[PDB]
Amino acid sequence: PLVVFVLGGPGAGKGTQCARIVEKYGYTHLSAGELLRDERKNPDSQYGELIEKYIKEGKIVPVEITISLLKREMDQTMAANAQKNKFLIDGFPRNQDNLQGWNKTMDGKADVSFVLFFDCNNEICIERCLERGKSSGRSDDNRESLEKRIQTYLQSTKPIIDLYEEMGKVKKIDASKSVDEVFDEVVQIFDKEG
């Protein structure tokens, strides 16, 4: 079970590239944020009632639940099809405590091949989020909530990038270019490694 973590703030173009990587390379894309939201909404589910307790208390849902959901999706995907063993994971990790939790709980159970980091300047990210907003119903987010979210994402994930750099595992991508230019960069990486 091989994992690639996909990092980058909002507007960085992750969504488009992940879909592209899934088609060409047969990776399975997991969204940590959407797996949690769906577990919460099923009160039927494994962890729905547990998540309900944390919500009631005004408390953050522990990363341990998130890792369990990621691990269950990986285990189920492979029990159906032992060949579908490569995973793109986004929405996790969000900070270095999340990442320590992963490394303590998942060693001997999954290998992180590498980390993809979609990088470009705040302004271009922000414009993307705003134009996606306008052109559909409308966004909750205005310019200054976006800039705040981008700033604190870069601050939170910097130690993750620093750490994976140290072991030669960061593949930086220039996310300011157009969809197909960026994907050419993504293809150079995945054709090499895997």
Side-chain angles (χ1 to χ4, degrees):
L2 305 173
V3 161
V4 168
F5 287 143
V6 172
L7 310 165
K14 289 168 285 176
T16 324
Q17 303 303 327
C18 288
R20 262 121 130 49
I21 290 162
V22 164
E23 228 287 345
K24 191 157 156 78
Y25 298 105
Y27 276 64
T28 302
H29 180 228
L30 301 174
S31 296
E34 164 237 77
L35 288 171
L36 185 56
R37 163 197 359 289
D38 288 336
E39 198 74 359
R40 183 192 89 241
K41 277 191 218 232
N42 266 95
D44 3 55
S45 62
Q46 194 169 1
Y47 303 120
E49 282 226 33
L50 180 56
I51 293 166
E52 161 164 65
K53 308 253 183 0
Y54 290 104
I55 294 322
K56 281 279 275 179
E57 298 179 279
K59 210 153 147 190
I60 180 159
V61 176
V63 70
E64 284 88 2
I65 290 168
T66 284
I67 299 170
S68 306
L69 292 171
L70 291 165
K71 177 191 187 298
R72 183 180 77 194
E73 291 293 285
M74 276 178 304
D75 290 2
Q76 293 175 354
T77 294
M78 290 186 65
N81 197 340
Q83 293 286 99
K84 280 270 178 186
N85 73 315
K86 305 188 152 80
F87 300 91
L88 272 184
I89 292 180
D90 77 359
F92 177 96
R94 310 200 48 70
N95 60 49
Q96 101 186 188
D97 270 275
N98 287 5
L99 182 51
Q100 195 176 60
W102 173 272
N103 286 324
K104 273 176 192 139
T105 63
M106 292 294 277
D107 228 330
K109 270 150 202 102
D111 276 3
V112 183
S113 309
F114 56 95
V115 165
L116 254 184
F117 175 42
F118 285 93
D119 193 49
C120 70
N121 69 65
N122 289 7
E123 175 60 24
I124 290 167
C125 289
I126 289 168
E127 305 242 28
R128 283 167 179 170
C129 295
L130 289 171
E131 68 193 16
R132 268 142 48 174
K134 193 114 78 164
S135 301
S136 51
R138 225 273 253 84
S139 244
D140 37 90
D141 268 294
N142 71 352
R143 159 175 298 279
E144 80 186 38
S145 311
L146 282 169
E147 224 240 298
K148 179 141 148 237
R149 258 173 66 210
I150 289 157
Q151 296 284 31
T152 75
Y153 178 88
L154 290 185
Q155 183 182 3
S156 287
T157 53
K158 209 32 157 194
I160 297 166
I161 302 303
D162 289 344
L163 177 117
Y164 278 111
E165 197 74 69
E166 256 300 289
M167 49 247 329
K169 278 185 183 341
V170 173
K171 328 276 165 241
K172 225 195 155 220
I173 298 296
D174 182 10
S176 70
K177 300 190 250 162
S178 72
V179 181
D180 296 289
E181 279 180 289
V182 170
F183 186 52
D184 289 328
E185 283 180 276
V186 164
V187 164
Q188 293 167 9
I189 291 162
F190 284 78
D191 277 19
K192 175 94 203 81
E193 296 241 0

